[PDB]
Design a protein around this ligand. Sequence first.
Ligand code: SF4
Ligand code: SF4
Ligand code: SF4
Ligand code: SF4
Ligand code: FES
Ligand SMILES: [K+]
Ligand SMILES: [Zn+2]
Lengths: 106, 114, 96, 84, 207, 690, 126, 48
Amino acid sequence: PSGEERCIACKLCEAICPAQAITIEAEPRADGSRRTTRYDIDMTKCIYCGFCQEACPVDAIVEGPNFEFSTETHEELLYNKEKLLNNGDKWEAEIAANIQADYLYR
Amino acid sequence: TSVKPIFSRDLNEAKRRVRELYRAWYREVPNTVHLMQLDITVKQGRDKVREMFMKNAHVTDPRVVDLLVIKGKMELQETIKVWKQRTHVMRFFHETETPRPKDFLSKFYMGHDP
Amino acid sequence: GVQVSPSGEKITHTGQVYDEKDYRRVRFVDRQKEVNENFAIDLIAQQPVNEVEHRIIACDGGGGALGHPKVYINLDKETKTGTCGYCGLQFKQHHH
Amino acid sequence: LGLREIRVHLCQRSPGSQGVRDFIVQRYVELKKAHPNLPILIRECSEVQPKLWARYAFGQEKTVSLNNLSADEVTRAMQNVLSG
Amino acid sequence: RPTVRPRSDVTHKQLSAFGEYVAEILPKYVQQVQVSCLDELEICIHPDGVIPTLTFLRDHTNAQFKSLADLTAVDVPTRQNRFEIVYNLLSLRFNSRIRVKTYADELTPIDSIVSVHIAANWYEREVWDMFGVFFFNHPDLRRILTDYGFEGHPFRKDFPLTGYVELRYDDEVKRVVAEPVELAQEFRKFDLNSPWEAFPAYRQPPE
Amino acid sequence: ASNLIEVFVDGQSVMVEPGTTVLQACEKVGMQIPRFCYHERLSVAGNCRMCLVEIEKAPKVVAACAMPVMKGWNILTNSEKSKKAREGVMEFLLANHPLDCPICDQGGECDLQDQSMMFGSDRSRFLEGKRAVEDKNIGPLVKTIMTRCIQCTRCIRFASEIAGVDDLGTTGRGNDMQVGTYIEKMFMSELSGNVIDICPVGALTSKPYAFTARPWETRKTESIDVMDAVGSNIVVSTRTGEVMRILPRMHEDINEEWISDKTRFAYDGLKRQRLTEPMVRNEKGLLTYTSWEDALSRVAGMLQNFEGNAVAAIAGGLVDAEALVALKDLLNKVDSDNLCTEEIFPTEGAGTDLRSNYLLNTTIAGVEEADVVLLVGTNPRFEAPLFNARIRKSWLHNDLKVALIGSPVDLTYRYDHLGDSPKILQDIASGRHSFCEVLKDAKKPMVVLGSSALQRDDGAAILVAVSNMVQKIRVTTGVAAEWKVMNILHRIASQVAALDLGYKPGVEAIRKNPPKMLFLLGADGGCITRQDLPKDCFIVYQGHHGDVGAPMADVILPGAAYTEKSATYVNTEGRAQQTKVAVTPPGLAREDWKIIRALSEIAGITLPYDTLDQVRNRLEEVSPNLVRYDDIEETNYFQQASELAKLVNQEVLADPLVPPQLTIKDFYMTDSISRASQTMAKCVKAVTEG
Amino acid sequence: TQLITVDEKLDITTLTGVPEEHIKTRKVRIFVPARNNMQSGVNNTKKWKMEFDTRERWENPLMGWASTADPLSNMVLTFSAKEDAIAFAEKNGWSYDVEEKKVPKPKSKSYGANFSWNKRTRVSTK
Amino acid sequence: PTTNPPTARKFIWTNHKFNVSATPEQYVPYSTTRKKIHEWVPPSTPYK
Ligand code: SF4
Ligand code: SF4
Ligand code: SF4
Ligand code: SF4
Ligand code: FES
Ligand SMILES: [K+]
Ligand SMILES: [Zn+2]
């Protein structure tokens, strides 16, 4: 809620990713926080299994409700950190409500 | 020393099986070129068959020669049928890829490869 | 805060801008290079410092299980504020 | 033509390199006095044959195998390499 | 203990008795008989006795294993005979399962059991296609799962995960052509092995 | 069974020496007892209590790391009592351990995590608040997050015994007990990343390797080390074609378990100031990028233009045996013998000829089994930190007597400073000294002459004086003639290999006969420049870093780094070792011997090797010990070398010889990679700042 | 009647289907992997690994990924014995470099040396 | 979301964007890397 990114560059979502669809290059930031520089998710390689969102210890990566994101080129489905943060900023009004409705089961 | 043969006691009947397989391939090449609309000629296909036999022609173990004969018979069977297509039978020619040169100057000019 | 390179393209929160002579800008020709405007470093820099009373303060992300793992920060150094490693929240001991 | 380098490859514990070891231990020093500008590289290894290499002007190397040779014949081979 | 399975020592004892029975009926071929703690009976035989062992287990009166469940191979490329051929057999009469193991190398074929079970036709075709284990007296032994011009046996341990060739459409020749494989990602192997042993029951004696 | 006692573990019946601990007996059978504070190269602490095991018919569990087995004991390692003890100790550690695992650095490298998963429980009964400890600022290399320290004192024991700085310790009592320095202390010594190695938790992590990778990500390539002539074995941890970390390996005869700070943190220089394309001088006189064809064509044209003595080569520190024999073969084919090294070795007497004349003849195990060590003209702490570490280990355990001739430098151990003058060598050889009576009371003498001492003008005089002293020592003591005395401590990775291959050491041949075409195989030392060189002289620089030898070169050929080529390096002991390819060289850079061979064939030199194995065969036929990898095969004929030196007549200089490495700030930057790394810049800044 | 005398070296490289480049121009390394110095556990040793020489891993122009060109990059093979690994490498026809197992040396350990009366092993901190 | 509006945050997009494929405002991938390697700069002064 402060606006700080939740991801802490811990890479265990790409460790558990059964398709090896995530790439999490990282370095210390200017203020010394442990953040990512490259967070790529290949949506053409991802199998949409939610293992990343159930492995993430800070609820950083989520699989929100958008499914109508079909593209006309292969390259547009090769997401990077800017695209993923834009999706998080776009769908936060729905993702937060779903996590509120769901987190007691998980 | 003291191994179990699979078809051939020694190299002579292994070479006999090789000659039988080569005769079968040599006879089947014109029918393959006629049936599957191949760009190549009959001479090119028979030269390719000879090239494959030659690139396998350095082994002196009877079991390995017998297994090569068996695999060649399987390949010949799927060429006798049209199980292999034009793409499958033209994969032997490598018409697309550029061969890596055999000289140190070229292999030094491009790539860190021996 | 997004900045603009002398080439013209925007600079991301990890400054990675293509150079003048880098050919990989045809991918942005007739298209756009999208940069997330909300820089997390600035957004957490503009957050106020929490004044607490104890020597050790526990941090979540703001929820019981919706936040991060519950850590403890030791505010013994009066010179610098203690920052939790997961969030970027800073805490200072109210020693008065 | 023109000797540039001598290399003597030998073994520390071998009956075949015994003459080479005796040659080095008894008349290498006078040889280095005689040629105090000629590199005579002595290399001892575990399981090598006694070998002598004579490197000349434009990279020509003459190789002499000298296993099971005595001190007189190894120093005669060395004088043959030096003279010609 | 609500988190641990029950044991069934009764069926462990039954499988041990039947293992003794088969091992004394066929001493010419049986090399080892073991029963696991999961109550599964494994009989490891010489490769020459595949046909008599499988025939005995197909139609013996006390051992009616007329249904062949599985026929597979395991590549262990550190033993001399690098392929372990495994038959999982089902007894509907006695409601039991048995496992029969034999070994092979790249140049030692095994007699096919198509004359005993007809499912062994396709199962041995798959074993030959994936491991290169030839089968004697197999009707139309050939590839079943690989591509038609495929070279090598991909389920072997020394075969790469991505293979050696890949296919793409080429517009110059107007074909689907094969090229040497070039990955844009390079599958990242992970060393997910803890340096601390987990099971002291399987601690091997030192060399 | 003379002095062997039978002890049982799980019924097995292993024989052990008296004084063997329970943990050592269990690992001799094959079982690794859990531990946190025990380290096999550190003193026994016995405080982590993770190694508690049950002895049969004994009501109290014993600490396996400290308890010696007596007789007929039956160690029940997997008993219920032992498992309960391990669970309790793991629970007590994880009660106050902070849950920082994702933001930590011991992801798959955590002994606490792994031993928790293997021996601890699966839950926590701790319903209280965890403690927190303020962090320290111990240096630019070791980042301290001391909240996750488990108070195991391993860093304290290391810094007291091996590093020997005595700056770390415990302040406080009870749960408030803290590890570190009480004051704001800048813990900066050589061998100081080994606390990052030995810290089982992520309390002491690597600041340059801050958050970049994970152990399951990292591919491990086992290689050797350069920029130190010890030749310590390392592991390069790369990921996605990029060098991420340098860890040590385990070689009991070279570096044991640890490496030095320069080799641990100097990998940052491999991505700065890197030659990536061939370059040639322009018509305006500036270096501009070109292709391999044009660059090697220019070099081949000038090589065909010039005859024998007009072509010369100088080889620097980070040069492999393959490239050295390649350039030697090329210059010999154009009839040039001017194949010089960067640093000087005296050629008088049997200089490069007899291999015993320039080697550490008694090895590092020789330092282990010696009793008196006389260091002449060296600072081993900065010239060869692993060698000095072994000297301190022998000084601690075997009661080694260490004396130093030269400048009084802060070696960690306490030594007898015999003075700072080379006349002490003649004084000892004649016999006038307290150290002379120490030597005549001694049994295993070992003298170590510095290559830095050989770098002086009177290098030949120093070498003959040392050799004469060795002869006097050997005739005074009753040495067994399988024990060597004379040793020479090199500081350059390429030097021993070059001397074995037959390079004339030092650039004095270049000074005597100035060439017109010059080759610089990474020659960044600045020994030869355009002032003492003639007008054009056609300099080509084959190297990986552009530091000193590149801006003065007519052409620049980008070679490979030691992490980028599979190469051969020979250490001070004379042991040849092989490094493997961790990553490929960047840009258009190629392997060095490949560059030389392609140059010869663009020219007219038929080099008889085509692949790396053929280069190794050439190395074997030049000197057949550069292919005996990890072989320590002995030399001889030191009597012959000594009497040749005694024939050589020189007078020693009356100058007090000082090492160039007087302080750690001088230690941190030595070669091109160290000068190019920003981490070493931060190190020298932290050392020089107040 | 079923035994024949064969004096070859058990060459199966014509049957493995590997291209001749990845047979001839390849160097495998046979080794017990070194203990990871960040941990004290030794279970990752004691198995002989065979690996291949590392080839070029370059950078993808589009995404910056690590692209490769050789298939035998992640080819860790596990063997229970050095001779088994040597035999497998010779059978598949790869040139090999084998290095010996580096066991740690047995060391004398005594807790009472930390409190010596005259030796230098006396520590100043527990 | 008229009786139960979502939680308002400053970083949430105030304006929604539909699928922007095959438009000038579409998404193009990068490599946020900062090049990881710095080559060299030869000096501008000729020779010494
Ligand atoms: S949902 Fe996709 S990105 Fe996440 S772990 Fe599964 S395959 Fe990987
Ligand atoms: S998204 Fe979550 S699991 Fe993945 S690296 Fe970031 S914090 Fe770790
Ligand atoms: S040291 Fe180990 S247990 Fe502690 S936070 Fe780090 S990974 Fe977790
Ligand atoms: S900092 Fe690490 S090595 Fe030192 S006492 Fe704490 S846990 Fe042990
Ligand atoms: S290992 Fe023995 S108490 Fe720590
Ligand atoms: K650590
Ligand atoms: Zn927080």
